Design a protein around this ligand. Structure first.
Ligand code: HEM
Ligand SMILES: O=C(O)c1ccc(CCCl)cc1
Ligand SMILES: [Cl-]
Ligand SMILES: [Mg+2]
Length: 393
């Protein structure tokens, strides 16, 4: 009843161009079985959304990667938020929600915007730049580590650590095995910066530790919650901003519309999150026998959700393969959906908005003028290098 497919969604050929294989996954049926990894797969919007919004049946406490924490040891102590289910998930989630709250965005927006304008000004002086290293990476590195309260020393471990985290969600292929092999120095750095004395006053890290006296989290929970932000808070925005710039570079008509109305910057970034879906996939584990799209999935089964495929499903989206900065993007699953929906989405949207605003006001054209190189990761979709020429407005 359930179709069996041999597609490996974690192969380099798949990363290089996933869209034909994602249509195959969608059109094979609402639920498929991936023989390569012995997991179920859902690639249509409907089933992805349903799984995300039934955390009781499709749990996260057994891991959101391929590995089932009930069968294998996690490569690192489980996240108190990402790899937890209600009710244990609830209070750690509340603390991060308040640490990254709408009121908190008011305290950082001016500095984030100023750093975005300054970066674009700097890049326009050079003209020809790498939109990845020099923009998508450089800008988040210039605001987020400081917003965390990290010292300057050792920040070079942050991106390698994040690449490891997102590779570790994948199956035990070479990408994952090699990442874990090289992980020891990055884990040591990150874990040490999570301790209260190492987080500067007023930053996200110190604010997490400050919540340890309300009864929502205990002092011994704060380090791992800082670890969450150091895991998910940087490389995500790198690939989100990278996606947005890549879209504007490929679709000059949409850059011209953005220039004509810079207030579209926020929706232009949201559309880029849907269009590229930098965070591609996550797993759930069934806690009971469940019926999903006519298939009966047994207990203790892994279910792979194709977020990027759901965001291009023609059953849900009109012209899904078009980048449209005025599209009604509400409902896309690029940030997830439900109780685990990205708790840092306000930070991600703030960074994306202010950067796209700077480009909208300062840049007249974005022209690819060199070889485009893709970066391969078991969970993240994005570029290694994006040579562009920036023409000033
Ligand atoms: C374009 C940028 C980003 C994207 C596309 C993204 C994507 C996602 C997705 C899809 C989830 C759901 C995971 C699941 O359902 O299992 C998630 C959760 C999460 N994200 Fe984001 N994220 C981004 C930026 C950020 C930032 C900036 C932060 C922190 C500053 C962050 C921290 C988190 C955390 C802690 C969770 C776990 C939430 C929970 O389990 O309740 N992310 N993110
Ligand atoms: O709590 C964490 O350590 C964690 C949370 C979310 C993510 C992926 C979000 Cl795109 C990775 C790690
Ligand atoms: Cl760690
Ligand atoms: Mg419809």
């Amino acid at each position: 009843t359930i179709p069996h497919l041999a597609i490996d969604p974690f192969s380099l050929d798949f990363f290089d161009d996933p869209y034909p294989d994602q249509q195959t996954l969608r059109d094979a049926g609402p639920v498929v079985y991936l023989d390569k990894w012995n997991v179920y797969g859902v690639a249509r919007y409907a089933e992805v959304h349903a799984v995300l919004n039934d955390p009781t049946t499709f749990c996260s406490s057994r891991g959101v990667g391929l590995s089932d924490f009930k069968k294998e040891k996690p490569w690192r102590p489980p996240s108190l938020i990402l790899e937890a289910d209600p009710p244990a998930h609830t209070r750690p989630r509340a603390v991060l929600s308040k640490v990254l709250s709408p009121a908190t965005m008011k305290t950082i927006r001016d500095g984030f915007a100023a750093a975005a304008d300054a970066k674009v000004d700097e890049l326009l002086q050079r003209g020809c730049i790498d939109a990845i290293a020099d923009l998508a990476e450089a800008y988040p590195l210039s605001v987020f580590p400081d917003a965390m309260g990290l010292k300057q020393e050792g920040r070079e471990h942050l991106l390698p650590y994040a690449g490891l985290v997102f590779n570790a969600f994948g199956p035990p292929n070479e990408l994952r095995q090699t990442a874990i092999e090289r992980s020891a120095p990055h884990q040591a750095y990150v874990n040490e910066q999570c301790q209260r004395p190492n987080l500067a006053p007023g930053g996200f890290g110190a604010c997490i530790h400050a919540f340890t006296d309300t009864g929502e989290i205990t002092p011994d929970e704060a380090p791992l919650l800082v670890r969450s932000l150091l895991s998910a808070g940087l490389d995500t925005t790198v690939n989100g901003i990278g996606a947005a710039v890549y879209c504007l570079a490929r679709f000059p008509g949409e850059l011209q519309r953005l220039r004509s109305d810079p207030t579209l910057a926020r929706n232009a970034f949201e559309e880029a999150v849907r269009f590229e879906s930098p965070v591609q996939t996550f797993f759930r584990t069934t806690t009971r026998e469940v019926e999903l799209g006519g298939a009966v999935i047994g207990e203790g089964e892994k279910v792979l959700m194709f977020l990027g495929s759901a965001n291009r499903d023609p059953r849900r989206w009109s012209d899904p393969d078009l980048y449209d900065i005025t599209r009604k993007t509400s409902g896309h699953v690029g940030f997830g959906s439900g109780v685990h929906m990205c708790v840092g989405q306000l930070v991600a949207r703030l960074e994306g908005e202010v950067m796209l605003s700077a480009l909208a006001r300062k840049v007249a054209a974005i022209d690819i003028d060199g070889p485009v190189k893709r970066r391969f990761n078991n969970t993240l979709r994005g570029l290694e290098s994006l040579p562009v020429k920036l023409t000033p407005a």
